[PDB]
Design an enzyme around this catalytic site. Structure first.
Site, short mmCIF file in Angstrom:
data_model
loop_
_atom_site.label_atom_id
_atom_site.label_comp_id
_atom_site.label_asym_id
_atom_site.label_seq_id
_atom_site.Cartn_x
_atom_site.Cartn_y
_atom_site.Cartn_z
N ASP A 94 0.75 -1.26 0.22
CA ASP A 94 0.00 -0.15 -0.06
C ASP A 94 0.79 1.40 0.02
O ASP A 94 1.63 1.59 1.15
CB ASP A 94 -0.96 -0.11 1.15
CG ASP A 94 -1.73 1.04 1.47
OD1 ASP A 94 -2.73 1.53 0.53
OD2 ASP A 94 -1.31 2.18 2.30
N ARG B 189 29.08 -40.72 1.09
CA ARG B 189 27.99 -39.47 0.90
C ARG B 189 29.04 -38.29 0.63
O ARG B 189 28.74 -37.47 -0.21
CB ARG B 189 27.04 -39.49 1.85
CG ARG B 189 26.11 -40.57 1.90
CD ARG B 189 25.27 -40.65 0.64
NE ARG B 189 24.16 -41.69 0.73
CZ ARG B 189 24.21 -42.81 0.18
NH1 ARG B 189 25.55 -43.26 -0.42
NH2 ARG B 189 23.47 -43.70 0.22
N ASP C 199 0.51 0.14 5.09
CA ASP C 199 0.60 1.07 6.32
C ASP C 199 -0.79 1.99 5.81
O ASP C 199 -0.78 3.00 5.04
CB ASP C 199 1.95 2.09 6.18
CG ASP C 199 1.96 3.09 6.92
OD1 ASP C 199 2.00 3.03 8.39
OD2 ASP C 199 1.69 4.32 6.72
N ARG D 116 -8.63 3.01 -8.15
CA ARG D 116 -10.01 2.88 -7.98
C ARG D 116 -10.79 1.88 -7.63
O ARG D 116 -12.01 1.29 -7.64
CB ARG D 116 -10.75 3.21 -9.36
CG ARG D 116 -10.77 4.81 -9.66
CD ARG D 116 -9.49 5.30 -10.44
NE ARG D 116 -9.38 6.30 -10.88
CZ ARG D 116 -8.38 7.09 -11.67
NH1 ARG D 116 -7.47 6.34 -11.88
NH2 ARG D 116 -8.66 8.12 -12.24
N1 LIG Z 1 -8.88 12.87 5.46
C1 LIG Z 1 -9.08 13.16 4.01
N2 LIG Z 1 -9.78 14.19 3.65
C2 LIG Z 1 -10.14 14.29 2.30
N3 LIG Z 1 -9.71 13.44 1.39
C3 LIG Z 1 -9.11 12.27 1.65
C4 LIG Z 1 -8.81 11.97 3.07
N4 LIG Z 1 -8.02 11.00 3.06
C5 LIG Z 1 -8.02 10.51 1.95
N5 LIG Z 1 -8.67 11.28 0.93
C6 LIG Z 1 -8.77 11.15 -0.57
O1 LIG Z 1 -8.74 9.71 -0.71
C7 LIG Z 1 -7.35 9.50 -1.52
C8 LIG Z 1 -6.33 8.65 -0.86
O2 LIG Z 1 -6.50 7.27 -1.67
P1 LIG Z 1 -5.85 5.97 -0.86
O3 LIG Z 1 -5.13 6.47 0.50
O4 LIG Z 1 -5.04 5.09 -1.93
O5 LIG Z 1 -7.16 5.15 -0.58
P2 LIG Z 1 -7.74 5.24 1.02
O6 LIG Z 1 -7.48 6.79 1.43
O7 LIG Z 1 -9.17 5.10 1.04
O8 LIG Z 1 -6.86 4.43 1.86
C9 LIG Z 1 -7.07 10.76 -2.08
O9 LIG Z 1 -7.09 10.84 -3.44
C10 LIG Z 1 -7.82 11.87 -1.10
O10 LIG Z 1 -8.63 12.75 -1.95
MG LIG Z 2 -3.89 4.96 7.75
#
Ligand SMILES: Nc1ncnc2c1ncn2[C@@H]1O[C@H](COP(=O)(O)OP(=O)(O)O)[C@@H](O)[C@H]1O
Ligand SMILES: [Mg+2]
Ligand SMILES: *[C@@H]1O[C@H](CO)[C@@H](O[C@@H]2O[C@H](CO)[C@@H](O[C@H]3O[C@H](CO)[C@@H](O)[C@H](O[C@@]4(O)[C@H](O)[C@@H](O)O[C@H](CO)[C@H]4O)[C@@H]3O)[C@H](O)[C@H]2NC(C)=O)[C@H](O)[C@H]1NC(C)=O
Ligand SMILES: *[C@@H]1O[C@H](CO)[C@@H](O[C@@H]2O[C@H](CO)[C@@H](O)[C@H](O)[C@H]2NC(C)=O)[C@H](O)[C@H]1NC(C)=O
Ligand SMILES: *[C@@H]1O[C@H](CO)[C@@H](O[C@@H]2O[C@H](CO)[C@@H](O)[C@H](O)[C@H]2NC(C)=O)[C@H](O)[C@H]1NC(C)=O
Ligand SMILES: *[C@@H]1O[C@H](CO)[C@@H](O)[C@H](O)[C@H]1NC(C)=O
Ligand SMILES: OC[C@H]1O[C@H](O)[C@@H](O)[C@@H](O)[C@@H]1O
Ligand code: ALF
Ligand SMILES: [Mg+2]
Lengths: 365, 910
Positions: B153, B872, B609, B583
């Site tokens: 991740d 052996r 993480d 996505r």
């Molecule tokens: N605290 C937050 N506030 C607003 N948007 C967030 C926040 N945390 C994550 N995001 C959105 O989620 C996305 C992060 O993707 P990712 O970290 O790969 O998946 P996830 O956040 O669901 O674990 C970013 O593009 C961001 O726009």
């Molecule tokens: Mg976290």
């Protein structure tokens, strides 16, 4: 306070030596081990090629011929000497009977006559050999008492309904009195008498002296313990009725202090072949000449074609005549030398540099 | 019973003191099942041995009546009943030795031993974060050498959550100019000049900072003046605040700034030394960076107030409040804020998130068609140079709209008993109107020593998978900044979106099916459903065909619905190193993880993480945690933990491989060392009509395999160093041994079984033929001539042979192994020579004086050790000459002195 301690051991960096298989290292170790091991093999073979041995089988010297001096069949006597090849000197055997014993099935005295061509090096052992004697039957080998070690006399319950080791098969008789030498191991003892001296037909004025003192070490001496036999609950074994028609009285108790051969039979042989020491001579140098022995025939053996004989030898640093150790030593030396030469040739024939990076399993591309 | 429980308790106590129902937490590994199969093989060998013993123990009906009846006379009778009785109890009391006694505990003994040696690795000890590798599950550690797949991740693992402000899109205008390492990497991979051009760009950015600070000082005086804490360099927006680009630009820019300052879930706290100084710490690093840069540019948010925000602009204070808040959800992937401002009172629903979740819902009928395109292009290039996309969408609510919102809220608040479903559905159905107003640009810094580590793992022949949810372009750019994603490979992108909708716009299932069929037919050849999957599972993976494959959210979502789709996806994901997915929710990627685990099962790493990674670790072969963001809680629901990702390079590559090889070699050694003990008894029992002759001592039932020779096998299992750590790090190609599984198979099982049989042949028949002729070898007295003393011979030969054999296969002759080998032989000699001088040896009683003093003992142990070791050892030599494996080759070349200039325990981060 919390930082881990740094050391070679906690990281597994203790000093070490890693030898690898290269001819510069492989060859010297082979050559040295091979030469020393073949040398010691030759030495032990030379030592073994010196001692003598005689053996005579007499299990069937009671109907092979009459009561005259007849020759023993060749399938019974084997002689090995370090100075003679065709030294046949067929021993003679004679049988003399006696009707004083009711047990006519096997009784009488068997006399044998053999000869030796050379003197001896003041070290003579005489053993009795038994062939095809099944002493590895569990019920047979797990049938003896523990009290006989110390001479104690416990109850019949402690010796019949005890644990896996007890005198179970022959615990009780009609009388009910227990057996001091209980168990089939003691009850199936060899029942022969051996002379304490050897007659010398050459010069009868000085026969050859023998003894039955010192077959085994002081282990039995460190095993002997004071006894308290009750002299009334002890009964002869059912196979000892001929030995003790009147049973044990207050005088004929089997003692252990001096003549331990009565109990030296405690532990059976390793396997089917059976051989135990019966006569020792350390003091008298045996010279060459003809000699004669006499043996009782009390122990029945023909009921199942079992074999029984005598065996006179000298011993050595590695026992008697048995070239098996030399055979294995030579085989090992030849095999190791052959491997060393084979790999030397493969290094000469397959001459190539030891560390080839291109030879790795990932250098194809 | 009690002894096993008490010894388990005492060894747990030892583990606890050295560290400062059932055992297995969830599931075992493949090694456990293969061990079960091997133990079943041992059991069936014992059973057939018992059968071939019992047939002879009873076939004696037509045999000759030997002296077995002339001495006993106790004819019990009942041949069909009593003889079968004797056979059954003889079998159950005399054939209980081949079954492994201590193996069932020794396996986890070895596992915990090597695990605690892992835990005490000072080279695996973090300096800044100060978190060494702390094992959780002591059971599953053998899989760490056979890893061939890594799931990562990148939210916290690949890059640390240290945010940096680069640009910002306001009304379609991008403000912010700088030069990061990602820009330099893009320029150098584009072929343009990077040294002179890079220095020119750096000095231009320095001039921009100089003029920005000069203008800031000249026009006014701010409250955040600082010589080193200042990170604001953008000169375009610092002047575009009052009137630079018109009054409408001012209105829109402060409107966007106010909307962003009204959208955050960040905790702001004062500094202990100076209350005015900001110590902003929270759970969302991006929002913390946004509020920090707002403070730097003038919107200073100082104070800790939850019922409203207090913000100052160059000293002018203003206070407000956000009415309703909906935090980020694992499925929502966005944060919602509902504010209401009295007068023209108006409500504003603002949704903050990524492009996919925001563009999904909006007013299709009412679209600007100008700001949308500008924001789309802005985010496209931002992802191109690697800026994490953070877009906000606004929705206005007028007086009638506010009243209907209040009515809906008060009529939908009466829902109880899991109202969350109803609320989610009603909000989704009535929240169809959205308008975008722009977004910001944030970038992330990498870890320490990422490129070299990932490159050497890739060169080790192992494949890794990396996951995210933001988008692909930022993902591929982060991969390009490091060296996991090299050039000379095209992208196997299967996105069901983008320009491909212009000419072939349809529903995603058939378009992704067509493209994957194209890939599976004319890009790679695996067209089929069954044969190719079986071929892949038989080949057990290999890095070849260095390309890159990209999947989109819709295709991954629909992939779970089709058996043919899952098998074809598994076939096409056989790329060399590069696999990327975006996505997708953690549930979907957990589903694909368990899909790839089920078919063509391969040990998978679950490094992660965050909060979405818990689904990865809970369904994985093995997982490692990272102490990064608030998702550090994942480490408790994990197997291993480490402060930073860069350490795992030493864990899986170096120590895991040693684990795998040591276990896979020592288990067959333990199986070898046990069979001879029973097989000698089997040959000794051939006589006496198979009555069950018990050759050895009654005390040899345990001390043979429990006290004397059980030391060196486990010693080699745990204290082996196959090769120096440094040379292994420089040359990790040996790790292919775990890739191809070249050390664990049934052929080795049978080969050592036959080896044990042959060794037992030698061990039994040497002393036996030493006694065949006259067995009078005493040199004084009578001799031994007993089964217990020949037993002493044969057990001594067997134990010295086994100890020298495991000493021989031991790869590191040190000051540690040989000492305990000598100690094992010494204690064997001492016990055999001392316990024999006791009443408990009532029958035997004379081993020391009647065996050791005999030169025949040494004369026979010499031939025993030669006929054991030499055949052996020559086989080892001929295998190392005609099939020289890589391990001994590298061992000898580095021993010769090629690789000695480098020190020991060297690191690339120094
Ligand atoms: N605290 C937050 N506030 C607003 N948007 C967030 C926040 N945390 C994550 N995001 C959105 O989620 C996305 C992060 O993707 P990712 O970290 O790969 O998946 P996830 O956040 O669901 O674990 C970013 O593009 C961001 O726009
Ligand atoms: Mg976290
Ligand atoms: C020498 O050592 C051997 C070794 O044990 C002794 O041989 C044993 O001799 C006894 C005595 O006969 C013998 O016991 C049984 O022998 C007959 C068949 O084996 C058996 O018929 C006989 O039974 C009687 O003779 C007894 O009077 C009594 O038992 O009643 C029956 C019925 O009336 C009667 O037939 C006796 O019970 C052992 O079998 C035999 N051992 C072996 C292995 O065969 C030998 O006695 C020792 N001699 C000396 C001088 O010590
Ligand atoms: C050596 O042994 C023989 C064998 O017994 C002895 O010969 C016996 O001698 C006595 C008297 O000397 C005679 O009564 C016997 O009849 C002899 N037996 C035989 C079988 O001939 C001989 O005496 C012994 N010699 C010595 C010195 O003890
Ligand atoms: C060899 O000589 C020794 C010593 O002279 C003999 O040992 C003695 O044997 C007698 C009878 O067996 C015992 O009464 C003595 O006590 C023994 N002496 C000692 C010191 O133990 C031995 O018997 C002789 N053996 C032969 C075959 O002649
Ligand atoms: C005891 O019996 C033995 C033989 O069994 C005999 O020689 C001895 O004279 C007997 N002694 C007494 C006192 O009965
Ligand atoms: O009585 C003791 C006893 O010991 C010895 C035997 O040879 C006998 O000659 C002697 O009488
Ligand atoms: F900062 Al996040 F998931 F919101 F890592
Ligand atoms: Mg969680």
């Amino acid at each position: 306070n919390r930082r881990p301690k740094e050391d070679a051991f906690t990281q597994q960096r203790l000093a070490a030596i890693n030898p690898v298989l290269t001819p510069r290292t492989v060859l010297p170790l082979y050559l040295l081990i091979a030469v020393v091991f073949v040398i010691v093999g030759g030495c032990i073979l030379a030592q073994n090629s010196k001692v003598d041995e005689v053996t005579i089988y007499y299990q069937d010297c009671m109907t092979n011929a009459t009561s005259s001096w007849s020759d023993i069949p060749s399938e019974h006597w084997q002689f090995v000497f370090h100075k003679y090849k065709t030294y046949n000197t067929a021993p003679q055997w004679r049988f003399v009977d006696d009707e004083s014993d009711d047990f006519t099935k096997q009784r009488g005295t068997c006399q044998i006559r053999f000869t030796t061509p050379s003197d001896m090096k003041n070290n003579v052992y005489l053993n009795y050999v038994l062939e095809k004697f099944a002493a590895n039957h569990r019920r047979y080998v797990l049938s003896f008492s523990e009290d006989q070690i110390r001479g104690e006399d416990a109850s019949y319950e402690t010796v019949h309904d005890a644990t896996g080791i007890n005198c179970k098969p022959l615990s009780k008789n009609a009388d009910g009195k227990i057996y001091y030498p209980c168990g089939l191991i003691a009850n199936s003892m060899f029942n022969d008498t051996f002379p304490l001296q050897l007659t010398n037909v050459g010069d009868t004025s000085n026969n050859y002296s023998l003894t039955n003192k010192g077959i085994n070490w002081e282990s039995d001496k460190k095993r002997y313990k004071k006894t308290k036999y009750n002299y009334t609950q002890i009964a002869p074994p059912p196979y000892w009725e001929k030995m003790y028609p009147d049973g044990y009285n207050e005088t004929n108790i089997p003692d252990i202090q001096d003549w331990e051969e009565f109990q030296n039979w405690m532990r059976p042989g390793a396997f089917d072949k059976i051989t135990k020491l019966i006569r020792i001579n350390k003091n008298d140098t045996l010279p060459a000449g003809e000699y004669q022995l006499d043996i009782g025939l009390h122990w029945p053996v023909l009921e199942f074609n079992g074999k029984k004989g005598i065996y006179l030898t000298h011993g050595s640093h590695l026992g008697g005549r048995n070239p098996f150790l030399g055979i294995v030593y030579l085989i090992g030396g030849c095999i190791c030398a052959a491997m060393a030469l084979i790999l030397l040739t493969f290094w000469l024939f397959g001459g190539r540099k030891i560390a080839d990076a291109s030879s790795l399993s990932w250098n194809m591309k | 019973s009690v002894p096993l429980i008490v010894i388990v308790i005492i060894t747990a106590i030892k583990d606890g003191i050295e560290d400062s129902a059932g055992v297995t937490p969830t599931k075992k590994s493949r090694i456990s099942r293969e061990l079960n199969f091997s133990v079943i093989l041992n059991f069936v060998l014992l059973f057939i041995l018992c059968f071939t013993a019992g047939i002879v123990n009873g076939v004696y009906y037509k045999q000759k009546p030997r002296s077995r009846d002339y001495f006993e006379f106790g004819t019990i009778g009942g041949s069909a009943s009593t003889n079968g009785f004797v056979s059954f109890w003889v079998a159950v009391i005399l054939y209980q030795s081949l079954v492994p006694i201590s193996l069932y505990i020794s396996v986890e003994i070895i596992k915990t031993a090597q695990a605690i040696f892992i835990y005490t690795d000072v080279l695996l000890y973090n300096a800044k974060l100060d978190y060494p590798c702390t094992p959780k599950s002591w059971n599953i550690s053998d899989d760490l050498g056979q890893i061939e797949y890594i799931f990562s991740d990148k939210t916290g693992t690949l890059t640390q959550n240290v945010m940096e402000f680069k640009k910002c899109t306001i009304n379609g205008v991008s403000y912010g100019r700088a030069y990061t390492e990602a820009l330099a990497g893009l320029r150098k991979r584009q072929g343009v000049d990077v040294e002179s051009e890079g220095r020119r760009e750096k000095e231009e950015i320095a001039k921009d900072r100089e003029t920005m600070i000069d203008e800031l000082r000249s026009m006014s005086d701010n409250t955040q003046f600082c010589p080193e804490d200042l990170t604001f360099v953008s000169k375009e927006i610092v002047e575009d605040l009052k009137g630079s680009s018109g009054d409408h630009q001012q209105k829109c820019c402060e409107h966007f700034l106010l909307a962003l300052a009204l959208c955050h879930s960040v905790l702001v706290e004062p500094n202990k030394d100076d209350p005015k100084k900001l110590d902003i710490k929270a759970q969302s690093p991006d929002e913390s960076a946004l509020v920090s840069t707002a403070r730097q540019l003038g919107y200073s948010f100082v104070g800790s107030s939850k019922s409203g925000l207090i913000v100052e602009i160059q000293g002018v204070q203003k206070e407000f409040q956000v009415l309703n808040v909906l935090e980020f959800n694992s499925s929502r992937k966005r944060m919602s804020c509902i504010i209401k401002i009295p007068g023209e009172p108006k409500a504003l629903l603002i949704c903050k998130g990524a492009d996919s979740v925001i563009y999904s819902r909006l007013d299709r009928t009412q679209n600007d068609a100008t700001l949308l395109e500008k924001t789309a292009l802005h985010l496209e290039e931002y992802a191109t140079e690697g800026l994490r996309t953070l877009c906000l969408a606004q929705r206005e609510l007028t007086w009638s709209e506010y009243e209907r919102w209040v009515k809906t809220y008060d009529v939908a608040a009466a829902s109880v008993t899991n109202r969350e479903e109803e609320l989610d559905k009603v909000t989704d159905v009535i929240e169809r109107e959205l308008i975008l107003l722009g977004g910001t640009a944030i970038e992330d810094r990498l870890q320490d020593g990422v490129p070299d580590s990932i490159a050497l793992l890739a060169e080790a022949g192992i494949k890794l998978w990396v996951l995210t949810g933001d988008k692909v372009e930022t993902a591929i750019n982060i991969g390009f900044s490091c060296n996991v994603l090299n050039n000379d490979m095209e992208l196997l992108v299967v996105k069901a979106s983008g320009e491909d909708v212009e000419e072939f716009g349809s529903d995603p299932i058939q378009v992704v099916n067509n493209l994957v069929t194209k890939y599976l037919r004319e890009k790679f050849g695996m067209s089929g459903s069954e044969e190719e999957l079986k071929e892949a599972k038989r080949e057990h993976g290999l890095p070849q065909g260095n390309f890159a494959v990209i999947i989109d959210g819709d295709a991954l979502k629909v992939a779970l619905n089709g058996e043919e789709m899952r098998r074809k996806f598994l076939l096409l994901c056989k790329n060399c190193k590069a696999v990327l997915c975006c996505r997708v929710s953690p549930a979907q990627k957990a589903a694909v993880v368990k899909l790839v685990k089920k078919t063509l099962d391969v040990m998978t790493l679950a490094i992660g993480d965050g909060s979405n990674d818990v689904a990865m670790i809970q369904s994985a072969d093995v997982g490692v945690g990272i102490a990064g963001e608030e998702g550090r809680q994942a480490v408790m629901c994990s197997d291993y933990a480490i402060g930073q990702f860069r350490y795992v390079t030493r864990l899986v590559l170096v120590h895991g491989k040693w684990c795998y090889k040591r276990l896979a070699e020592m288990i067959p050694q333990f199986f070898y060392k046990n069979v001879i003990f029973t097989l000698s008894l089997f040959w000794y029992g051939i006589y006496n009509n198979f009555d069950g002759s018990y050759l050895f001592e009654y005390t040899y039932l345990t001390f043979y395999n429990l006290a004397f020779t059980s030391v060196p096998v486990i010693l080699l299992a745990v204290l082996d160093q196959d090769v120096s750590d440094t040379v292994s790090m420089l040359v990790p190609q040996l790790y292919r041994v775990g890739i191809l599984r070249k050390e664990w198979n049934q052929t080795k099982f049978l080969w050592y079984m036959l080896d044990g049989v042959y060794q037992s042949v030698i061990c039994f028949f040497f002393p036996y033929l030493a006694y065949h002729k006259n067995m009078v070898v005493t040199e004084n007295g009578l001799g031994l001539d007993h089964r217990y003393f020949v037993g002493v011979f044969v057990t001594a030969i067997a134990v010295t042979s086994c100890n020298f054999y495991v000493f021989m296969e031991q790869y590191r002759w040190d000051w540690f192994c040989g000492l305990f080998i000598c100690l094992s032989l010494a204690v064997f000699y001492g016990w055999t020579g001392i316990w024999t001088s006791s009443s408990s040896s009532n029958e035997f009683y004379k081993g020391a004086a009647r065996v050791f003093a005999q030169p025949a003992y040494w004369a026979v142990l010499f031939v025993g050790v030669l006929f054991c070791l030499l055949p052996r050892f020559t086989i080892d030599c001929i295998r190392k000459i005609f099939y020289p494996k890589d391990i001994e080759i590298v061992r000898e070349m580095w021993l010769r002195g090629d690789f000695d200039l480098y020190p020991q325990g060297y690191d690339p981060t120094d």
